Amino acid sequence: SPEIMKDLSINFGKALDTCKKELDLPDSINEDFYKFWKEDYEITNRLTGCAIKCLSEKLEMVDADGKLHHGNAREFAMKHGADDAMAKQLVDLIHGCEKSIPPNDDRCMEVLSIAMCFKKEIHNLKWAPNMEVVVGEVLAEV
Numbered sequence: 666s667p668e669i670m671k672d673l674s675i676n677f678g679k680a681l682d683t684c685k686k687e688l689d690l691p692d693s694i695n696e697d698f699y700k701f702w703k704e705d706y707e708i709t710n711r712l713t714g715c716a717i718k719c720l721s722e723k724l725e726m727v728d729a730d731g732k733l734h735h736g737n738a739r740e741f742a743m744k745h746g747a748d749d750a751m752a753k754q755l756v757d758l759i760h761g762c763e764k765s766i767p768p769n770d771d772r773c774m775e776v777l778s779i780a781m782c783f784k785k786e787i788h789n790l791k792w793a794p795n796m797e798v799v800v801g802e803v804l805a806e807v
Contacts, residue, residue: 702796714773721804733801742798
């Protein structure tokens, strides 16, 4: 029973814009980017990766509702559907990936490879939250 959108896409939008300006990303990519977190495509671009990071620091302009924060998605993921067991599994996975990749330090690369995994797996698991929670996840991670 959709028909909402009080102020979600807008926020994430202003945040993405600020980045594109600081990251210099042609809008063309802004669109293709959205697709990635919805299908199974891949932006495979160290740049689009830094973006995911930039957004994290933007958390202030992202969702000030008082839920999504560095190391806190459980609440932001619960409002959508990722309840306890879920949010826990979601975090236990996104993090599991971090525990999988070698002890690196390339946030852009580490955050990129995980995004592809965290989602892929969830897709074959059984269900799948909204691209929203998924984002607040990679972001809240760092």
